[PDB]
Amino acid sequence: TAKMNLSDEVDLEDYVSRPDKISAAEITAICQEAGMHAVRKNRYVILPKDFEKGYRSNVKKPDTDFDFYK
């Protein structure tokens, strides 16, 4: 995220703390995807919401884990 804007409120650890088993390129993928979304939105800084559209967009895994097993 170093070369990102992340204007005022995007909490970096806010999405890191999620379990969100990811991959070293997966972080880069989420970053770029948020960047592309902002480009479509023309936000010269990464709005704290676009982090939401990114984290869930890139971690789109159909795990469908049943809570029955707990």
Partner: protein, 148 residues
């Protein structure tokens, strides 16, 4: 002392039309509605309500780029005709806050901050003007003209 009610009612009606057009995705309609709202606010010289409306429209979920561009350009056009230097500073601060982090308004933000730095220099606050106008990285503004 009766124009305030008419102003607020007209602003609400224009906001409803703006919401309709924005949900419809019509760039021209939304832009024209926003320009009409700005014209109504200006003609009434209600600068505080003008700034409040600018912020409100800038912070709405899903606003179109071109409508905001037209709003900001017209607001900069309004800067010269205002009578009060304090109102100048307040309006400039509001536009700068709105335009921050918006690629398609960085030109307007840069011109606005240069004007504010000039105003601060006129007041003798050289340090404040320098520190404030230093905050822009114009290097990255590819859309900007080299000369300026």
């Amino acid at each position: 002392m009766d124009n305030g009610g008419n102003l607020e009612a007209q602003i609400d009606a224009l906001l409803n039309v703006e919401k309709q057009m924005r949900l419809a995705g019509d760039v021209a309609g939304t832009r024209k509605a926003a320009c009409d709202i700005l014209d109504l606010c200006f003609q009434s010289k209600a600068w505080k309500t003008l700034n409040d409306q600018i912020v409100v429209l800038s912070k709405r979920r899903g606003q179109l780029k071109q409508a905001v561009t037209a709003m900001v350009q017209q607001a900069m056009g309004y800067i010269d005709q205002t009578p009060d230097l304090d109102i100048r500073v307040e309006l400039i601060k509001t536009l700068n806050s709105v335009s921050a982090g918006k690629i398609y308004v960085e030109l307007e933000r840069a011109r606005l901050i240069k004007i504010l730095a000039k105003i601060k220099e006129q007041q003798g606050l050289i340090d404040e003007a320098a520190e404030l106008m230093q905050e822009i990285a114009v290097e990255t503004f590819g859309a900007m003209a080299k000369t300026e």
